Amino acid sequence: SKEYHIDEEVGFALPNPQENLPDFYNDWMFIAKHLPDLIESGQLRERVEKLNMLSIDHLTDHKSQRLARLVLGCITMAYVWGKGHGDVRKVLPRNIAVPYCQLSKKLELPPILVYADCVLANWKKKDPNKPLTYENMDVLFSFRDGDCSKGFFLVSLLVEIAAASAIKVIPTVFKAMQMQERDTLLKALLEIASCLEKALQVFHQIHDHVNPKAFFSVLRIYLSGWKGNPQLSDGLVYEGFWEDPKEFAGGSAGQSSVFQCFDVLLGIQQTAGGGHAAQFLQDMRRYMPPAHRNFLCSLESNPSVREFVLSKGDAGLREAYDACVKALVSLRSYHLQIVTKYILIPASQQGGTDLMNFLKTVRSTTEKSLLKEG
Ligand code: HEM
Ligand SMILES: O[C@H](C[C@H]1c2ccccc2-c2cncn21)C1CCCCC1
């Protein structure tokens, strides 16, 4: 793979994200690195409002621009939602909104915190010579003490990383159809299936590191956006950059490329059909790093893996293909059980129906791609 910013070890995750910005930006970093303290003491907003305007010119390399997106995105979430009890701000001040927006357009991303900010670039190893294991990793930024952001972000990232070993096989699949190399393709499909079955075990770590109460009542709040949100009905005013309010959705794993790229690979047309679910997933591509968007665009322009398998009358190939679809169905089914525990039941003490019907649509579409099954 080329300049699609895909890493052979960590996949769509940003490799070795840097922890520190230039000294020109310490006033940003001191805020972001102390969000728990400043929100609780009610000092955050005042200190945001006391900021001067830094130019984004001293952010020269891609890594530091990503880190700055993660810093200004967390600060914005904290500024907008405050202590997370519903007393919101509807105006982002000039002095953070301008640099945040100039940086976001520079990177072809919206000026709101997205998946690629707070998962893909929000991590580090404690010990660089150890393995990419939960025990040896940590997030860069959290919102509140006890918000379980570390567990939530890291377990997502560890799933993202487990998918990386299946991504590096994609080149093999397309090369094999182009060369009409059936046995080579069959093995490639089985290797992808195996990797997706291994990513299921990674999901099991969510239970040991995320608490439903804290997740539902705290973390969810700081991850909300201002699209179709009754609390900022017309959106957020990015003061000094746009005279008008604007709506952007909060962080959503529909912005993640790991599952979409396998949907594309397997010919699971998740974005066809006119439903709300297809609409949502297509909309969320604008919240992906443009290089990953372009990678997904490259997958779609390739010949259909599915139609190739269906056209060969080859039971071995159809079973290898179905192994991949079954593995995807298995992930989304377990994931649905997660949502039941972490959203549905906390909501009822001790809305979600729309969210789960979305996931259920995505799952059933996946399940309908199975072959000689029906
Ligand atoms: C407490 C744990 C979790 C909860 C409550 C949860 C909840 C949700 C919800 C409500 C959605 C639909 C809205 C959206 O797009 O974000 C969703 C989608 C999604 N989530 Fe999660 N999630 C959790 C953990 C994870 C983890 C660890 C991953 C690993 C990457 C993940 C991957 C995805 C993906 C790929 C989607 C897009 C839908 C699909 O492809 O089927 N989720 N999740
Ligand atoms: O699903 C998204 C959150 C999202 C997210 C944000 C940041 C990092 C990871 C993830 C994630 C993983 N699965 C869903 N999401 C919201 C949807 C509203 C309920 C609380 C979760």
Kindly describe this structure.
One of its GO terms (cellular component) is stereocilium bundle. It comes from Homo sapiens. This is Indoleamine 2,3-dioxygenase 1. The chain has 374 residues and is mainly α. The chain has two domains: 1-17 and 146-223 and 249-374, Methane Monooxygenase Hydroxylase, Chain G, domain 1 (Up-down Bundle), CATH 1.20.58.480; 18-145 and 224-248, no CATH class. It contains 17 helices and five strands. The protein has helices spanning 26-32, 35-40, 44-49, 62-81, 94-106, 115-118, 149-167, 170-178, 182-203, 206-209, 212-222, 257-265, 276-283, 290-301, 305-310, 315-348, 352-367; strands spanning 91-92, 124-125, 137-138, 236-238, 245-246. The chain has a three-stranded mixed β-sheet. A two-stranded antiparallel sheet has the order 2-3. Helix 9 runs parallel beside helix 16 (315-348), helix 11 crosses helix 16 (315-348) and helix 16 (315-348) runs antiparallel to helix 17. The longest helix has 34 residues, at 315-348. 40% of the residues are buried. Ligand 5PK binds at residues 115, 118-119, 153, 156, 220, 223, 251-253, 343.
